[PDB]
Design an enzyme around this catalytic site. Structure first.
Site, PDB file in Angstrom:
ATOM      1  N   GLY A 229       3.830   1.600  -1.319  1.00 18.70           N
ATOM      2  CA  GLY A 229       4.285   1.782  -2.685  1.00 18.70           C
ATOM      3  C   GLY A 229       3.226   2.407  -3.570  1.00 18.70           C
ATOM      4  O   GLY A 229       3.527   3.273  -4.394  1.00 18.70           O
ATOM      5  N   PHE A 230       1.968   1.993  -3.402  1.00 20.40           N
ATOM      6  CA  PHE A 230       0.930   2.534  -4.283  1.00 20.40           C
ATOM      7  C   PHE A 230       0.539   3.968  -3.934  1.00 20.40           C
ATOM      8  O   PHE A 230       0.284   4.777  -4.833  1.00 20.40           O
ATOM      9  CB  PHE A 230      -0.296   1.630  -4.273  1.00 20.40           C
ATOM     10  CG  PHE A 230       0.005   0.221  -4.663  1.00 20.40           C
ATOM     11  CD1 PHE A 230       0.868  -0.043  -5.715  1.00 20.40           C
ATOM     12  CD2 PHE A 230      -0.569  -0.839  -3.988  1.00 20.40           C
ATOM     13  CE1 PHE A 230       1.153  -1.342  -6.086  1.00 20.40           C
ATOM     14  CE2 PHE A 230      -0.290  -2.139  -4.356  1.00 20.40           C
ATOM     15  CZ  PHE A 230       0.576  -2.391  -5.405  1.00 20.40           C
ATOM     16  N   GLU A 231       0.468   4.306  -2.647  1.00 25.56           N
ATOM     17  CA  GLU A 231       0.067   5.648  -2.241  1.00 25.56           C
ATOM     18  C   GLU A 231       1.172   6.674  -2.422  1.00 25.56           C
ATOM     19  O   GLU A 231       0.877   7.868  -2.562  1.00 25.56           O
ATOM     20  CB  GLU A 231      -0.375   5.656  -0.775  1.00 25.56           C
ATOM     21  CG  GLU A 231      -1.652   4.897  -0.490  1.00 25.56           C
ATOM     22  CD  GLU A 231      -2.811   5.382  -1.335  1.00 25.56           C
ATOM     23  OE1 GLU A 231      -3.133   6.588  -1.273  1.00 25.56           O
ATOM     24  OE2 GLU A 231      -3.402   4.554  -2.060  1.00 25.56           O
ATOM     25  N   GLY A 232       2.428   6.244  -2.413  1.00 27.21           N
ATOM     26  CA  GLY A 232       3.536   7.172  -2.380  1.00 27.21           C
ATOM     27  C   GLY A 232       3.745   7.728  -0.989  1.00 27.21           C
ATOM     28  O   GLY A 232       2.820   7.740  -0.173  1.00 27.21           O
TER      29      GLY A 232
ATOM     30  N   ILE B  99       0.829  -1.200   0.000  1.00 27.82           N
ATOM     31  CA  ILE B  99       0.000   0.000   0.000  1.00 27.82           C
ATOM     32  C   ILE B  99       0.866   1.254   0.000  1.00 27.82           C
ATOM     33  O   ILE B  99       0.545   2.244  -0.667  1.00 27.82           O
ATOM     34  CB  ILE B  99      -0.970  -0.025   1.195  1.00 27.82           C
ATOM     35  CG1 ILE B  99      -1.983  -1.160   1.032  1.00 27.82           C
ATOM     36  CG2 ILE B  99      -1.701   1.292   1.315  1.00 27.82           C
ATOM     37  CD1 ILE B  99      -2.683  -1.542   2.323  1.00 27.82           C
TER      38      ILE B  99
END
Lengths: 147, 147
Positions: free
Chosen positions: A14-17, A12
């Site tokens: 990685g996906f949200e930054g 998560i």
């Protein structure tokens, strides 16, 4: 009952930054950390806010709690921690109603783990368009589910 | 009494997308064109179906009829065509029950158009999750409503 472990948290994150300064997410909702829009005390994120990495991780863990509760309520078969983490990423992205109505969950609760894993890939669309980022995300989630 | 004009149709085409081959939406409901799941003859969309863009336009206009009927029954004040189109997009997305119980409709039917316009923006959640795409839809509907 399970909570999201480091595999799901890293997925998560990685996906949200990572953003340690509050930012407009593109639609005027001020966001910070790993997708946080409201601190655990109820205070909304606002322009000019800053946070530390540790604070951002704590806020993400708090944001996940309602979806973890949903997963523990909705899934009626055993889950490995990897499978729970993959479902936490999926449900954090798509919401509890999409999980509750999904063919994914229907197959999962029949004991059909492989069919459930393949259903992650169906959820690759935004506005009717297949998004390459959503394809990559669903593939990562399926890979963790099958690990 | 009004029907959805090109403005509302474009709003809905924006977030449904165009897919001339039938696809699974993730809850087992096969979908085609601009979000159609049932043809106007009552036949459900199924895997393997294909349609032309013209057919998809006809199907979308048919899909909107139930929501147009709901708006014309529930709204008791004048509407510009822009306001009707905004409500058509909103109600297509959220359903008749949500419109009927909304503070949006309550304020609108008092004659409080500005309050209703602002109520569009509170419907930005799905499954407990604030969705950027829903914020975008609601802001577009509000802007058209106010135009």
């Amino acid at each position: 009952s399970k909570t999201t472990s480091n595999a799901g948290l890293n997925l998560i994150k990685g996906f949200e930054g990572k953003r340690l300064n509050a930012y407009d997410d593109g639609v005027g909702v001020w966001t910070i950390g790993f997708g946080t829009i409201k601190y655990p005390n109820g205070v909304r994120v606002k322009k000019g806010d800053t946070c530390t990495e540790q604070q951002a991780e704590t806020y993400l863990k708090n944001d996940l709690t309602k979806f973890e509760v949903a997963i523990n309520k909705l899934v009626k078969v055993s889950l490995t921690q990897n499978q729970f983490d993959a479902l936490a990423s999926f449900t954090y992205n798509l919401g509890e109603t999409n999980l509750a109505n999904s063919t994914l969950l229907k197959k999962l609760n029949k004991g059909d783990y492989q069919g459930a894993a393949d259903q992650f890939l169906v959820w690759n669309k935004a506005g009717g368009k297949v998004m390459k980022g959503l394809v990559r995300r669903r593939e990562a989630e399926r890979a963790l589910f099958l690990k």
